[PDB]
């Protein structure tokens, strides 16, 4: 009931200005078998129109207000972490490339097969256009042969404004009142 | 008890117009071992009078209001996802065949045995007559031999006005307030 | 479970003075296989400064206000505890070398694999320069041959003030109101 | 939440007289593999300064107030109990060596891993100088070979007054109010 | 002392609105051995949080104001220009894809090994998002075998508004004062 | 004459509070033939008394205000740079570990034998206690055998208040004014 | 040297309430050849009638007020300290477990054959029932073979109240004025 | 008795604000057999809660006031100095790393056995948070084989305000008075 | 460059009191090939008396007011620096044996052959009798065999007062006004 | 406790005018094996700036007030005087080269190896500018071969005034009241 509170906060504020609140799934994936030092995962979001906003350092579109709210790791990735087939570590979340926002507590320990997995500390918002970039700082890297790249899922509440009566300036008038 | 916030809201508003409020369970089953790409699951609700609306794209009757409130996965299915005996992925939830409203976070995550299980994002009101349709976009599909089809359960609160004095002007007066 | 409330407490208090609120990860580790008596865990914090504060007895920098919030234990540490490969016990938390303000409840009982994973009582403040130091009081020490050192990951809420007008005047005014 | 009400009550009440409230852990250890009849467990409290007040019949010092709030049994101890590697039974909690106040319900049942763990009945206040002592009444003793001593953990809220002023007036005034 | 003239202008004009001014080294490099005609150097600016804005025709992020101030040529380039290992020529500097504002005076004469290096004509400011592209118009191109690409270093002053209490409309409000 | 305005400002402003202004040299030595990646230079400052404040991360004393004004490179070091006996690159200047304030423009370019030597962009003020640290990012690193360490000299304007009166009130009043 | 001032202070204040003042010898001895880290000495007091309170953490009787005044070290210890047969260091003196009240100045410098035999600073008053415990902090520990335990004798001024008209109401009225 | 004039000064001034006064022993130990030139000893204080503030450059916490009162040398060190087994010299005592306050007169002279031992020159008040560091400038260094490191003991009176009602407002009102 | 202004300042100010103004030559030379650490240069001043003032620590005579203005390094020294025949570094200028007021900027860069020969920032005053003394701080010291000592020539403006009515009362009246 | 009185007398009088009281160490060394007649020792004070103020007949600078308060002779010197390896005798202490102020009693008898060594008679002050010079008048000179020079350490309290607001008549105002 952590994402259900920012969702319910969004739909009562985006209603008098027009606003299409819906939830998506964002997948950050560090490419090709991290073994030494700080690397860069490829952010990859899925909006409505089957459009894959991929590549490093996503810019939020000019009419959307995002909220990064949750994270979890699948079972076949967690079975690769403890067996030494992919690296453990944390994930650093940067806003505008400069300002640090959060740090994920040890992606092996927010796996989904454990009944008391750890959480994030806050729901990180992102205004109209800003540069979301993430970095994966590894500890205890990959040791076994035929190792695998990392994958960490997120969950974004997306507040769209493209279908308002004038989708140019309501998206920052509603950015202030939020 | 996010259903019980919706349940106690439906008994409170649909009572002066006369209205039968009860909860039932909807079954969306992607058939025959999804292994490649986007498919479409068969919705199957259980309404009151011994009838079962099967098939895709459930049409809401003109005297009823539905509410999709929660979702989970059975424990023998969560055994089969992590074993590679059936496919993982997300579920897209549409309204009137067009409007995307939800994306369930990676159905391996919402197994009912975990107390730290990520739920649905928000309770979706489904109006009088309006098409409910779902799709299943697979990621990490089924790999092992003797695979099984997928099943994802839902909890639906159904409000009914077919036993009032006038079923027409009871619905159109309660759909605006509630 | 308290780490979401003191994060929201530092945001609405540091905004008139101006300053970050973010989170990081702190690792405490008693070296080399405790089997007899009270040993010293090596604190190790990383900040946005990209400088690792290692060894015992961390000193909080002059523009930051730390908040010690939660703690967890990974699964292969918890498999070591039940097999006697490492020691159980509690962790004591000191301030300024004199005061003792907490006790972590039995580091096996806060493992990530217990469905009743227990948390801390209240968040511990740390003003500009003060001394964070910890001690491990082992009950039921390690019995098996080829033991392993302990590791308990903490969670800090860090309230930076480095980007104000003058952080020497700002950080001692927000230290009073928080 | 029975320790938290006691903790907030002790922080609110013992503040204006000057009072240092914290929480520690108490260990009751029935040594040497009890197999026949009623024994006496060795108490051991770990206070500030690694003093480790050990042995039977802990005399509360003349400036502190103790609050025996909750009790549990660690998970390897529960594994040893249900395999018959250590004895089961109840724990009798006495004040001044004559007056009985509590009997803990069957220490196998209060393992910390269960969410349905039976708690202690009430938070027992121990005033300045007074003799806490406990006894262990065993039912179904240890039958398997390589038996282990019993260990039961308690949680104490220590309210110290030595640092404030003349501690005599502070202790008698706080003991009058709270 | 022309870089320090607009740097001091930046820190006194973006200070009442809140603005974090700093300097940054920029790189523009014509790839793979220009030999006949007009080419295009690949820009590369590294803002502080290790995001690398690369490729031709950079876009300015939405909260920053840039000032392109200095340019020079390193000594391993200048030994290669006069020996016919790479091309001479000029560099044209555009903004918004329409405006020409500068031409660098014959980059071999902008080398740093000469005690009378010639400078640019004016410090070119750069608004929030506006395309910054450069072109290499060579005279006397590369002659000898084993030719090398060109490299021309710049020096840009970056004003940053990431830490204010207003979104990217205070940035253009401070672009109206500068 | 960028150091002289800082000197006249420190003489004029710090005189009524009692203030001893002088100028000194700081040496940054990146040791042991940097050839691959980003390294850390050994700082070494010589204030009054032959204290030789050495090592990384010089903390400013709690009674002084520093002013990093200019930087240069000695002429045999420039000879070693242009022949590939030591690495070229930039130096990033940090305050309190997080705040990047300057990047020195390509230390080969700031040889002291050139009258057209590029300077720093601004004289950076360091308040009372704060962590001054630098980093060396090499571009076109050292290639020839028998390589040499890098050395970059800075000019510091030290404004001392320790010998005047009670130095705390004086240094905070001065840091408020100038 | 401070014993003669508090003995005259004891016999003056304790006579209006009934007062029975004498002195005795306390023996503190860390067992078994301290060589690495902080040890716990075994206290042993000698009261009147073959009442030899022993073990760690002595508890004061309910009718007496102790005063810990001086200490000394015999010659067969001091010839073992200088030859490396036992450890040097200081002794820490606690009260109620929490307060640290003194530090004995370097037990090899309190020997009975030093012509400048150092004494304690002020005598520490000990109330009715209150845990007196000590701790030994070794610097330059034992290095030679066939090492020996430590023994440091003290001097206690005991103010007994057993022969007053009421031995309970007399002490807590004289403990307030002494 | 220069400490007893300071100890009775600290308990008189810090009493209306509420403040813990006690004495400890600080150890300055130059590591590993100084034989050539100026070195730096490792300061090592022993505060209340069993901590050992080791390492160079002791930082005073924001609630404490320190007083450096005397200095001496243990008798097995004085035997090693005069036989040429460790080095002689003086000791410099700095405040905030810059301001020299004392120079101890030739540490071979201040042996604790001589009644005509030259003491420290003055009792130095060390203000709240402020660096303490020492250096050892040797004359007649260590010559004999199997040499040993140095150790010079100090006596520190610690005034502590961490147990007052407001530890911020207590120190800054008592640092001015005391 | 300042040596013509302080000459013209000294002439127009001493004429109400009557006095010589003339310029001399000061030679500071470290003995015997500095290769490791901080050495002492031997000052050697010549005056109108045909009198050398040799050795360290020149004392200004009782009726003169000196002014240390500029410095330079001859070409046969500057060819020795680049070939590693003597040490680089800076020269510190002390007054009264306590105060530091200048640091000469890198004696290679004030050579007579550098086209940007740098000067001293401001002139150093010296009253009636005070102790001028200097120290040489070597960075990048001499490595080559058959090394050479350093020699750095200065320029002193001498204000003699021996031709007034009384040279003792005149020089203490002009020392205040100049 | 003789130097601690003149140190306290200085800081009570140097406080209202400004002033930096600190303790030093003076080393007088009659060079190269005095065997016949009256010699002159090389005085050598070590001030704050690590200034080796060498040479015969030190001059007190115009802003300092010294106090010669102590003398002692080390243990390796005293074993050479009795062995006939260097000369015994007294040291004459002259003011301005004219006045005789004191005479030390037989420098072999102010050794530090003896528990009740002799002292000086009075603490000799020194005003602004005056010539402190010493002479060594030997009785019983060195007799055996391989002789050594003499060395006698002193202890100077130096009252400095160079950092006052006007160090020209503050030192002549405080010279009167002292």
UniProtKB/Swiss-Prot annotation, chains A, B, C, D, E, F, G, H, I, J:
<keyword id="KW-0167">Capsid protein</keyword>
<keyword id="KW-0946">Virion</keyword>
<dbReference type="GO" id="GO:0019030">
    <property type="term" value="C:icosahedral viral capsid"/>
</dbReference>
<comment type="function">
    <text>VP4 self-assembles to form, together with capsid protein VP10, an icosahedral caspid of 87 nm in diameter, with a T=43 symmetry and composed of 420 hexamers and 12 pentamers. VP4 proteins arrange into hexons, while VP10 proteins form the pentameric densities located at the 5-fold axes in the virion. The stoichiometry of VP4:VP10 is 42:1.</text>
</comment>
<protein>
    <recommendedName>
        <fullName>Capsid protein VP4</fullName>
    </recommendedName>
</protein>
